[PDB]
Amino acid sequence: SDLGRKLLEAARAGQDDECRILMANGADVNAADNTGTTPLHLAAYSGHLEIVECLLKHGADVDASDVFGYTPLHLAAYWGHLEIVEVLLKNGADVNAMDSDGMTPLHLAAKWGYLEIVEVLLKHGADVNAQDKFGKTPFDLAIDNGNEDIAEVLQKAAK
Ligand SMILES: [Hg+2]
Numbered sequence: 001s002d003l004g005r006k007l008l009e010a011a012r013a014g015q016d017d018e019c020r021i022l023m024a025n026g027a028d029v030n031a032a033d034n035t036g037t038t039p040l041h042l043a044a045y046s047g048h049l050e051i052v053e054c055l056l057k058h059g060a061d062v063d064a065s066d067v068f069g070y071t072p073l074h075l076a077a078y079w080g081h082l083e084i085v086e087v088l089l090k091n092g093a094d095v096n097a098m099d100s101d102g103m104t105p106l107h108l109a110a111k112w113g114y115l116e117i118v119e120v121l122l123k124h125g126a127d128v129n130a131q132d133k134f135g136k137t138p139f140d141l142a143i144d145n146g147n148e149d150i151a152e153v154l155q156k157a158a159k
Contacts, residue, residue: 004031011039011055014048019055029058036066044072044088047081052088062091069099077105077121080114085121095124102132110138110154113147118154128158 007027010018019039023029032038040060043051052072056062063071073093076085085105089095096104106126109117118138122128131137136144139158142151 001028001031003027005033007031007039008033008037008042011042011048011051012046014043014046014051016048016050016054019051023054023058029055029060030064032064032066035068036064037070038064038066038072040064040072041066041070041075044081044084045075045079047079047084049081049083049087052084056087056091062088062093063097065097067100069097069101071097071099073097073105074099074103074108077108077114077117078112080109080112080117082114082117082120085117089120089124095121096127096130098130102130104130104132104138106130106138107132107136107141110142110147110150111145113145113150115147115150115153118150122153122157128154 007022030038040055065071073088076088098104106121139154
């Protein structure tokens with residue numbers, strides 16, 4: 001429908017007030033585009049905290065998956081959006097969700113040097129022993145990407 005699209009675009013562009021109205025007008029909060037990405041994905045992807053909070057308020061599926069197996073949490077960790085991660089986790093996001101390549105949010109965070117986020121994920125039970133389709137663990141990816149401080153943290157959490 002039109003409302004669904006408007007909502008996706010409003011989320012993408014970070015139009016809080018626009019998104020607000022679309023909710024009032026009965027926009028499908030769980031609308032999906034050609035690649036199965038929902039408004040929550042896009043809000044998490046762009047780093048629009050308030051929109052994320054509003055979407056969740058209106059029953060947005062916190063663990064929705066696109067064609068790549070990506071969930072909002074994956075996108076949040078991917079771009080280093082700390083606050084949004086904490087919110088998604090608070091709303092019952094699967095901290096160990098796996099994408100098409102078997103990557104978990106912890107894999108992504110460790111890979112792209114997001115220390116503070118690595119910590120938050122660990123608090124909520126992120127599995128340090130999870131392996132992607134290459135047998136790589138968050139530790140392996142930390143080391144491979146020259147993020148030593150994070151690697152050291154992960155190593156100490158496994159013991
Ligand atoms: Hg909204």
